[PDB]
Structure formats: C-alpha cells, structure tokens
Design an enzyme around this catalytic site. Sequence first.
Site, PDB file in Angstrom:
ATOM      1  N   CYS A   1      -0.893   1.907   0.536  1.00 14.35           N
ATOM      2  CA  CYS A   1      -0.279   2.739   1.166  1.00 14.35           C
ATOM      3  C   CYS A   1       0.046   2.343   2.126  1.00 14.35           C
ATOM      4  O   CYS A   1       1.484   2.347   1.964  1.00 14.35           O
ATOM      5  CB  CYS A   1      -1.022   4.025   1.427  1.00 14.35           C
ATOM      6  SG  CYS A   1      -2.670   3.786   2.610  1.00 14.35           S
TER       7      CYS A   1
ATOM      8  N   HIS B   1      -3.565   7.258   6.219  1.00 11.30           N
ATOM      9  CA  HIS B   1      -2.487   6.928   4.487  1.00 11.30           C
ATOM     10  C   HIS B   1      -1.484   7.356   5.494  1.00 11.30           C
ATOM     11  O   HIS B   1      -1.238   7.805   6.628  1.00 11.30           O
ATOM     12  CB  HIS B   1      -2.885   8.675   3.550  1.00 11.30           C
ATOM     13  CG  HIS B   1      -2.113   8.211   2.563  1.00 11.30           C
ATOM     14  ND1 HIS B   1      -2.609   7.519   1.502  1.00 11.30           N
ATOM     15  CD2 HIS B   1      -1.365   9.010   1.816  1.00 11.30           C
ATOM     16  CE1 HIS B   1      -1.574   7.462   0.561  1.00 11.30           C
ATOM     17  NE2 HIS B   1      -1.259   9.059   0.812  1.00 11.30           N
TER      18      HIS B   1
END
EC number: 3.4.19.11
Length: 147
Positions: free
Chosen positions: A28, A89
């Site tokens: 990510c 994230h």
Amino acid sequence: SLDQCIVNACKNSWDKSYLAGTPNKDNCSGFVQSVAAELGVPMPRGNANAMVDGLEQSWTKLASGAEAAQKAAQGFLVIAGLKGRTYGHVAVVISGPLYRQKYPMCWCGSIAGAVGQSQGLKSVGQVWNRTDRDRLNYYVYSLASCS
C-alpha cells in the site's frame, strides 16, 4: 473531470516495485510513492503509519470523502489514510460517484491480496471495513498534478 493523469499514474504504478522484490500491488505504501513520483509530488516516506503522520503534519486536510472526490476531479492528488495499532493503510482517491453516497473510488495496493486492493473500481468504503470506513482522513496536495 481532470483526474486522468492521476489514474494513469496509478495504472502505471500498479506493476512497479518501490521496494526491491515487492510489486506495488502488494505494498500500500510503496504504491503511493510511485504514484507520487510519476506526478512530481513530494510524499512523506515510510510505512503507512509514518506516511499518515507526515500528511497530518504537512498536507491540507479535507472534510468529507465528497470533498476528496472533488479535489481529484480538480486534478489534485488525494490520499485517504488511517493509522492502525500495528499497520496503517493508504490509498489514492479518484474522482467519480461516491459509493453508498459517501465513499469515493480509489486505487491502493495491499499485502492482504485482492480484498485489500483496488484498481479504480472499489471505493475506500470497500477497501476499509464497516468500522474504519467512517474514520478515514483525506489529504490533498497543494498544487494540481493534472492540466
């Protein structure tokens, strides 16, 4: 809508490896480093959590996912991010219709596989879960990336 160069950067970054031996589609953080580099946008470095601390400290912070999808449409790089107790994230928000009338579409790699991933067709509210979806932060860079 002017987000196309962002989308394109996203598509291109998807197959890159910001880390040796690690395709961005599974990282990510790495995934947005490449998106940012293809657009000449300075981006705080580090794992997801460290990147969010950096955005928090230095980038513009938007109010809603709605406001995030507008800045994408305006040609601005937008990052949706949320720390975790252990791992955070981050994702790139793109323009287009909000999912469940609230959560913008995005691109994001993920070490978790397909269910953590999105190639422009999953909203942030389908990457993050029922609980985290409403806790996201949205950061926009201060100059547009797309003409």
